[PDB]
Design a protein around this nucleic acid. Structure first.
Lengths: 49, 124, 225, 34, 52, 49, 187, 147
RNA sequence: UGAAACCGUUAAGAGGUAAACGGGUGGGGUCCGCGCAGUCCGCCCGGAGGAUUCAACCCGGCGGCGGGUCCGGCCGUGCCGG
RNA sequence: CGCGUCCCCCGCGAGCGCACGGGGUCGGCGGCGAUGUCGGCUACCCACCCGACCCGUCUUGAAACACGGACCAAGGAGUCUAACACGUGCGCGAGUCGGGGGCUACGAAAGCCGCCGUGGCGCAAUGAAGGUGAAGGCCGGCGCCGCCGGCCGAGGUGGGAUCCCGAGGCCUUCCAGUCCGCCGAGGGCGCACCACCGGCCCGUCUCGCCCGCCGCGCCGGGGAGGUGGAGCACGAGCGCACGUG
RNA sequence: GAGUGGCGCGGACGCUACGCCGCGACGAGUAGGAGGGCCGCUGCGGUGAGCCUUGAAGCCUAGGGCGCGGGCCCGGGUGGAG
């Protein structure tokens, strides 16, 4: 995560660097589900950047 | 490892800021704020960082914990010291020496902490 | 325990001190010997010339062993044979100086770079002045000033030349290790002659300031040192 | 190195469920910027 | 005019070659149109083998 | 395959195997010395002769 | 104002590897320290060889490393290559060898580990043997390359067995005049 | 890469690195391989000997497939089969020699450059050298021919 | 948007070796230092004010190391078994 | 400038201080201070002393009575493609490479095929050609066999970075001494590479003697000694990218 | 070097290792060759949680400076969208 942070990705709240999410991410069908997932995994502050 | 992911970010990092024959790095745990293998706040297992507090008064001493380092939400322990100037610095010297946690960053951390306290101190 | 440890380090320091004092005493007593060697050397030729003149015969003394060579002319417009001999003597610059010991081989090398050098037979004083004031060693091929005796001792320790008085003795009284003591000395960067020259281009005999100046080289050494 | 640690797997609510996958050796490949 | 030791070359470029340069920017659109015509035929001769 | 497996030369160069088989550091700086003419300067002439 | 020729004042050898390979660059960092801080000459030789171009650190064949480690006193000593260890397929028996090399090819790995042989890396050679004690440093054939046939005297000089640059080879490709006394001459 | 080139460091320099006394003129020694026997005689005689003249017989219609004969040596002969065959051939006690069809591997002729490991073998090649054959009699083997 | 060449006018200075140029100063302008009683920094001493204030000892939570060699886990460009 | 001891003649005192001592310091001073003065080198104008011919270009030689140039702005000249050679970086390595083909917004990209390596270059040369096509001694039986066999087997000399052994030695008031680490007399294994002598393969010449058989012949194979080759003598190549010619 | 026998909780700077430091000698140059450019121009992939109608580019300037130089950075004016 030293190399990723030096790219400028704002990931000081991601619980794990690999962020291997569940397999029902692929079953999603709305951008409201996709943003809410990124909010809960705390990767949203990269999208705000 | 430290020397490996130094040779990647020594010239080609987001934080690197070259101008006027001067090279700094705007890293969240760099203290002395310069492009080095020592003071880089992202490379190492052990890292010390001194910030001004969330409010006006006090400082915040940031210690990177040994255990989980691919685990960035739990990697850093933040403590606040809102004491007098001597008792603020004495706490930092006792956090860095008496844990044997980067003894080469002891004097640089006390100089930075003193500068933060002198900054948040009114002008006549 | 450490009482033992620092006691041992104190002993080893004191051992190093007494080794310094023993060497220092050797430098003092060798300088006192060389003084006595020089005075009896000086007296002898006055004695031998007197006893010769008393009988009514002549005393031809020893033809001198040591020469001091000064380059007087510069780098521009110079023959290739004159170039090679000048850089074999190490006179690669105008107003450079080296000692060369006289044999048959060196005199026939001197007389073919004759108009470019002003050379002669030096005095004990001149040899003292040159090696004390302009003395630099060729230590690691670097021109380093001979400020201490631990330069000469560390370089020329094998030939039993351990101080400046040893160096000056081996140069003056052309000894065994003249080669390794002369090649140790970096060529002497002398000043311009204070009072000027007579004439650079021509021989000493015909008014000028080139060629062999037998005992008169010491006067040129004063004005350039 | 030859340390393949035990990477966790997160729910859709951003919390570590007990399910674990071993970090594949692709991530231990020699990182070459050149 | 030859410089030193080096191979003795005969480039076949004495004619008006620049007029007859055939450039392959067609290629990925040529592959797509072939794959298109292929699937079209494979669907046309419907239960029969695609190769023929 | 890696060209060196263990890339932590922090640990390697202070490890007892390597540190055992080294020679002591020469950490003292020797600046140039000003040449004092010992024919004028008595003590320097005493330091030599 | 001194007569020196400055032609040969600069020395034209390598102080650093041209390569921006970081793993190679950390090995060079690691062996600059050992070249400086030991009276070992092995570490000075290995450091110097880490700088050299691929055409100067050639591939050592497995059969050369079998032969040069079966010699009389090379018993249970480490075979050190700075280049690469390529498999030789024409050799049948491979003894137990202890190999340290930058690259080793997939066939030569699987071959040397088939026996009791062990394959090191240079970070391991430093921890195992800092001064290079109990090592045999080997080089591959440096005039192996095709390029050297074309070098020396000019092809078409008397007693020059030098390979000339021809487009193709046949009967009408540089066989006629100065190659037979039938046609004009021959050297 | 136009940045790394020599042109970019001749900007300012007058002749652009082609001299002042002799210019960069167009074709001052003729075009291509001209002047071969005249004013480029030394270059041709010195670096390209035997260039001019005729040698040998002309073969009008030449087909390269009739003269197709790829070679293998005894060095690399056991590599056309598995290591399994070589191991199990020594491991077997009946004296059974494994059969190496050389034309299956895509070589017609067997040449005899190599040392051979000591076990019996049959070689089904289209051609054979003398020393190639002798070495397989020496190891204690057969030379079956293929049409 | 409004360049340069070139021209008009306003101000300053100068002017018989065509002008212009490099080096060294002197003289006068134009603005600038937002100049013009002049450095802050440690610790100690010498006086005087203030503040609810140290050292120690309870209760809690967090972190470091090594627990030389506890107990349980997971990994292995490790190896021996079924 | 102690004796307790080693000859021929007569191993740790204690302080304090001055300094011609591995490159300058003062524990010395004195002025002047708000629209009239202090500093400001560079930069605007002027004066004075010294120096000072107008650039470009071809030339042995340019300030030239050599040519081009009245002045200003914008444009304006070693490029791209193919080929080759050598250096250099990267990947795989006796290999290597899908470039043509096929498969399943960015994307005409990227990914994949291996029973898509046809093929290219490489791993074998030499001859015009038909063709041929790359190491051996010894030990018995048949001071000898064409062979039956048997053991072992990719040369030698000289120089060679490193490596290896170690005659001895590296201390604290001694004497033995044990373990590691270290220096070194002398003596060995010798990398790459260079020079030399051997040898093997192809062409061709000289001299000579034996062997084989489904085909006894203008059949086929073999030996010794020189000699011609872009050769072998335990591989370095291929692909990509950059540089100069 | 190592073993067995005879009170006070303290200690400047450092080490972009492609960095920092020490010592010695040297420095003309056309054609020509090489290196280093934190010299400059225009566009593409990344990146600066960059700058900008509280005024971008551009242009003018007896303003303040930096660099051996290529050049550059600030001040004032004009200008109006990058």
């Amino acid at each position: 995560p030293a190399l990723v942070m030096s790219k400028g990705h704002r990931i000081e709240e991601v619980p794990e660097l690999p962020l291997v999410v569940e397999d029902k991410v692929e079953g999603y069908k709305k951008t409201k589900e996709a943003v809410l997932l990124l909010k809960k995994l705390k990767a949203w502050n990269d999208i705000k950047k | 490892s430290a020397h490996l992911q130094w040779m990647v970010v020594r010239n080609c990092s987001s934080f690197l800021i070259k101008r006027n024959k001067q090279t700094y790095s705007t890293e969240p745990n760099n203290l002395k704020a310069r492009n080095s293998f020592r003071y880089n706040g992202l490379i190492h297992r052990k890292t010390v960082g001194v910030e001004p507090a969330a409010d006006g008064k006090g400082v915040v001493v940031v210690m990177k914990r040994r255990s989980g380092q691919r685990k960035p939400a739990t990697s850093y322990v933040r403590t606040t010291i809102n004491k007098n100037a001597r008792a603020t610095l004495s706490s930092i010297r006792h956090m860095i020496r008496k844990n044997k946690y980067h003894p080469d960053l002891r004097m640089a951390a006390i100089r930075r902490a003193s500068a933060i306290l002198r900054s948040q101190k009114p002008v006549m | 325990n450490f009482a033992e440890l620092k006691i041992k380090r104190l002993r080893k320091k004191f051992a190093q001190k007494m080794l310094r004092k023993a060497r220092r005493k050797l430098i003092y007593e060798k300088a006192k010997h060389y003084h006595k060697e020089y005075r009896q050397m000086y007296r002898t030729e006055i004695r031998m010339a007197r006893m010769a003149r008393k009988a009514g015969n002549f005393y031809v003394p020893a033809e001198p062993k040591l020469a001091f060579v000064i380059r007087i002319r510069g780098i521009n417009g110079v023959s290739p044979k004159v170039r090679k001999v000048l850089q074999l003597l190490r006179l690669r610059q105008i107003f450079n100086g080296t000692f060369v010991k006289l044999n048959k081989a060196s005199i026939n090398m001197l007389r073919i770079v004759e108009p470019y050098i002003a050379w002669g037979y030096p005095n004990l004083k001149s040899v003292n002045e040159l090696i004390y004031k302009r003395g630099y060693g060729k230590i690691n091929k670097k021109r380093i000033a001979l400020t201490d005796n631990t330069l000469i001792a560390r370089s020329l320790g094998k030939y039993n030349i351990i101080c400046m008085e040893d160096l000056i003795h081996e140069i003056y009284t052309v000894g065994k290790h003249f080669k390794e003591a002369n090649n140790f000395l970096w060529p002497f960067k002398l000043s311009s002659p204070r009072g000027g020259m007579k004439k650079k281009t021509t021989h000493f005999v015909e008014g000028g300031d080139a060629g062999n100046r037998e005992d008169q080289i010491n006067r040129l050494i004063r004005r350039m040192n | 190195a030859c340390a393949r640690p035990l990477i966790s797997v997160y729910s859709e609510k951003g919390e570590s469920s007990g399910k674990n996958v071993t970090l594949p050796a692709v991530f231990k490949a020699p990182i070459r910027p050149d | 005019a030859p410089s030193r030791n080096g191979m003795i070359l005969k480039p076949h470029f004495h004619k008006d070659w620049q007029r007859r340069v055939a450039t392959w920017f067609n290629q990925p659109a040529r592959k797509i149109r072939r794959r298109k015509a292929r699937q079209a035929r494979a669907r046309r001769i419907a239960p029969r083998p695609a190769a023929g | 395959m890696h060209k060196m497996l263990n890339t932590d030369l922090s640990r390697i160069l202070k490890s007892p195997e390597i540190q055992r088989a080294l020679r002591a550091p020469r950490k003292k700086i020797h600046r140039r010395v000003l040449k004092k003419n010992p024919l004028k300067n008595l003590r320097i002439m005493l330091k030599l002769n | 104002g001194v007569d020196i020729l400055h032609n040969k004042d600069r020395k034209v050898w390598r102080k650093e590897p041209k390569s921006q390979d970081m793993y190679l660059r950390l090995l060079v960092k690691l062996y600059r320290f050992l070249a400086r801080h030991t009276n070992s000459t092995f570490n000075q030789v290995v450091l110097k060889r880490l700088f050299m171009s691929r055409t100067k650190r050639p591939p050592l064949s497995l059969s050369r490393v079998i032969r040069k480690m079966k010699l009389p006193d090379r018993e249970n000593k480490t075979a050190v290559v700075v280049g690469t260890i390529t498999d030789d397929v024409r050799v049948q028996e491979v003894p137990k060898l202890k190999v340290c090399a930058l690259r080793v090819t997939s066939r030569a790995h699987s071959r040397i580990l088939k026996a009791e042989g062990k394959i090191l890396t240079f970070h391991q050679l430093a921890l195992d043997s800092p001064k290079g004690r109990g090592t045999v440093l080997l080089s591959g054939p440096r005039k192996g390359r095709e390029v050297y046939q074309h070098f020396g005297k000019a092809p078409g000089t008397p007693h020059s067995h030098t390979k000339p640059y021809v487009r193709s080879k046949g009967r009408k490709f540089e066989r006629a005049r100065g190659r037979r006394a039938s046609w004009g001459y021959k050297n | 890469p136009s940045r790394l080139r020599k042109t970019r460091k001749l900007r300012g320099h007058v002749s652009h690195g082609h001299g002042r006394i002799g210019k960069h003129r167009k074709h001052p020694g003729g075009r291509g391989n001209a002047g071969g026997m005249h004013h480029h005689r030394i270059n041709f005689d010195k670096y390209h000997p035997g260039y001019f003249g005729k040698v040998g017989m002309r073969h009008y219609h030449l087909k390269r497939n009739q003269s197709f004969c790829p070679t293998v040596n005894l060095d690399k002969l056991w590599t056309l089969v598995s290591e399994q065959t070589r191991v199990n051939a020594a491991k077997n006690k009946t004296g059974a020699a494994p059969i190496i069809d050389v034309v299956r591997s895509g070589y017609y002729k067997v040449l005899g450059k190599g040392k051979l490991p000591k076990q019996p073998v049959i070689v089904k090649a289209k051609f054979f050298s003398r020393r190639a054959e002798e070495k397989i009699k020496g190891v204690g083997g057969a030379c079956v021919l293929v049409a």
